[model samples]
Target: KKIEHKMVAVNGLNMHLAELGEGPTILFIHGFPELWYSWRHQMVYLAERGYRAVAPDLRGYGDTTGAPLNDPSKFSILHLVGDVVALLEAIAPNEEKVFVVAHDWGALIAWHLCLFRPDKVKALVNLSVHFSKRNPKMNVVEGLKAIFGEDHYISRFQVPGEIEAEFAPIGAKSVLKKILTYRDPAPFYFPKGKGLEAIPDAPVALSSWLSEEELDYYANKFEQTGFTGAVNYYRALPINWELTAPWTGAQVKVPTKFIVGEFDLVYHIPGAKEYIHNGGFKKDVPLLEEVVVLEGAAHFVSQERPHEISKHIYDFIQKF
Candidate 1:
């Protein structure tokens, strides 16, 4: 209740954002199927430590606007970054740049923001994902298909209405529980006829990281927006690849730090760990200052270890 919520006009849409505290800005960007609430813990944590923490719902998720069901093109990285730029202009017009702390899909967009507009970002503390250099030979979908195949979750999400239809019968809360509870360090795929049937409904104990009440918060939002808007991000994977061709070899020049769970599926993806630990990630993001690997944590490490994640973010950003 201490956090302030408001809808501000940004990139031709009303963007829902939550802000707290007072100081230099720290903009939080959430991933897929998540709302500004994902950063609720971090917002207040940082707000208490002399920073104005701001978390936005992004273009499609939560109370934000401008996600059109009929168009997947608008969900591209360009559109997403446009919203961030406009949000900064609306909220911190006089500030030269702001600190960014992002997770999952939000990390992806944050990378793009740093790439395209380095001057607007003071420093970056990204979680769960890393900067992926564009493959000139393959668009994102084709690349994923080559590595993970047609059954991969992102590949299965390519078709517009089909996945949405499959998710409909499963219901919002069930779908939310199923996806949020997933901890497998492997790729996800949804086969036809299986739908949510593939996910077991056993009375499994909830993780200490996520609570029934928190899950309900997420479920209620998804119930209102539907999955279509959120799924559109995956649908535009190839589109983003095509549109981002000019940045084929561009690097993220902003000072940065990345954190990922040692057990996180993304961190374990085939060659991902090697790339991140070795020189490959440094080659793409030369300004990268540190990489923290948390043991016994999963993809949702931000929530799984909120105090730890907040400390990592605060520690890194304070240096800049």
Candidate 2:
């Protein structure tokens, strides 16, 4: 029920980390605009199930520091994978591999962590976001527009200085509230052309899994980190994409699982699932476990339905 905090030096940065329980390792990597606390449920549930649950505030996101921003090479997937590999070396030195779970941008890096260093990762579970294969033949901007269509708001964030101002005006917290309350309302099968106008306006439902105190914990973390580090992730997308281009043929041969809220807007983007089906444009990955969609939930799948998400994660690990 308690998280043991640790500081690790990896990839030219000092990373803030938290570990709970002790057994086979399960490492959680947080997504954008968030920190290690995002995996609070898994930290307890998985640890109780006899697994070492470790969550780390990835570089440039939390108390962690030492990210090399000026060197575009350091921010690429290769470096991100190096950071995870380095962490694994420090945490489970004797163990050969660890179950890797991630969401959003963390999911992006975790998938590549499997590719960049296959020896360090065992099973993989990613939520909200799917894997993306880089296309150096096409510029990242054009490639995003090609797949995301015109409605994917993430592309707008890719624009320089555009999204920063939008969050700055509202002091970031207000903007976060909007994202926390966001949900996708429509035909789930057709996600390409959806827009914000298509989403419903309902009373913001607080996360059933998190108490006010816990929510405040996350809010305070963001308060100090602000949205800059979180948003910097968007800045890395194109660069990361280009860096991943050579691996376009790299398929996730490792056991993989996907779980997300039914109403999570992630599937609302164009070609979101295609990557999983295509295997980063390589031959299809035959090891895909399943993509389970939890009904009546939103983007914060763990916050909205902790029991279900925890059970799913446990079940996924059971398969391995």
Candidate 3:
């Protein structure tokens, strides 16, 4: 009963924003195969505690409109961050800074947002994906392909419409469940042509953390939007790599806290844990205040452990 929905223009798109409560605002950004609904639990949790939580179904996803799905350039990191800046300006012009909480692809966008406009973020609490400094030599898709090979999910996403064709037969609900339930600590791969269909079904059914209705919410939205818009993020890799060259040694100076489930594939990605613990993460995010690794958790840490994740966000941002 707390959240409110509205459509606001951001970066030439009609973005859908869901907001709740009233206090300092928190901007929540969700990842691939997800919508603003992904943060529903955090939004309510924080809002009930004297904070306003704002979330958006980002460009090319959910009810948001105006993305040219055929044009990969429109989904670059530059474009995503621009939509964020414009979204904030449109929603709270009088306020120059707000708290940030992001996960997965959203976490990636948050890192770039901090790098591009630290002044707009008071502090950040990012989940799943960490700020891996750009590799001037290798673009992300090629780097993942070389390391994890062509079967790697990110590599399979590079070709326009290839993965989508694979997913079309799986149907939205099954596909959503498969991705949301994935927790393998080993390297993730999606064989060419097989795509999501090749992965084994999640064991134990829908687990205690997820409700049938909630899964349906995700499935219903994906059924409407299809996967093209979300996959475009991977397709825009070389574009992001080239565009980010100017900021090669750039440091994400914003005060930040990072968290990841211990079993998250990203946490197990080559050299990921080493970089996080061996000072590379702190070196890049100089103001990085804390890094928490949640035991027995997986990639969708935000929703899987909503209460703890919400508390983690509150504990860190309350200091500011």
Candidate 4:
């Protein structure tokens, strides 16, 4: 019950952080449509074990402000990675390197942080998304469109203001729950103009992993911030794909443990399953220590299965 909140100036923005405990820092990165509160369970668990656990609302996200919300380019992968580097410098200047545990979009940033500045990280425990060597020939957004068709969620989010208008009618809480509880092991998609309306309502019984209070905490923040800031990450994909041309063959040099849910949509995408298990992941991440796929868990595995995730994180980081 003692997680602390504060605003720290980072990368020319006021970044909100939820932090607890003290020791080697473990920076938690949350995914889209989420806030620093997403890491509450892991923060406390690791904090109690004598670690300083910190999670931040990324640019254009909850409470962290200063981005030109109208400009998707401001939220590019480079900007996202810069914020993380600046955050590390701001919060733990004395520490040469710290541990990192990230999920979803946060995991994307963490992978880049390691790639861009491996010296700043001692080790990493990444959940959900896994790194694929950047393809020089394909723009990520364009590739997804060809593979999944335009209705794929990524495609639906590309045009600025189009999807936001679609989400406006659905209240924030309903929108958050609908997306968070999605578990089908298939590619996520939404038809044009329908926003989430193209999908079914979340099950009558909320998943046991999420509670009304916790959901409200997320809802209240997204309600104020809107989803544009969150969705901007998607909007900037083609831009990021273009900007990161220099890092095409880059590898995440940090020592890492990868985890994902058996039911996660990403895990089932075309060759994602084969790549992760059939040595492609190992070839890409040489120091890759292990891979753990949890049963019955889904995209939001960090929260859907917090204790197990926390345990896996602790076990891996303990090696260094």
Best by TM-score: 3
- By lDDT, the best candidate is 3
Candidate 3, which segments miss by more than 4 Å at Cα? 195-197
Full candidate order by TM-score, most accurate first: 3, 4, 1, 2
- Candidate 2 residue runs with Cα over 4 Å from true position: 68-74, 135-140, 146-152, 159-162, 185-200, 206-211, 273-283
Instruction: List model 2 lDDT by residue over 1-320, tens digit each.
Output: 57889898886889999989988999898886678888988789999989999899987777888875434345566767788888888878988988988988888888788777777878888887766655457755566567756444555655445555555545545555545666654321212323233334556444445466765776667677665556566666667766666676667777888777766666655565566444542343457776677777877776677788788889888987
lDDT of 4 by residue, 1-320 (tens): 49888999988799999889998899999997788888888998899888999998899989898988899999998999999999999999989999999988999998889989999999999888999567778887888789989898899889899888877887799888888888777666778656676665445553878989988998888889888999999999988888887887667788999999988888887888888889889887899976999987888977889899999988888887
Question: What C-alpha lDDT do the candidate models reach, one value each?
Answer: 0.86, 0.71, 0.88, 0.87
lDDT tens readout by residue for model 1, 32-59: 7788898988998899899999998988
Ranking the candidates on lDDT from highest down gives 3, 4, 1, 2
Q: Across residues 26-83, which tens digit of lDDT does each residue of candidate 3 receive?
A: 9999997899999988888898899889999988999999999999889999999999
Report per-prediction Cα RMSD to one decimal.
1.6, 4.4, 1.3, 1.4
Better of 3 and 4 by lDDT: 3
Pairs with steric clashes in candidate 4: none
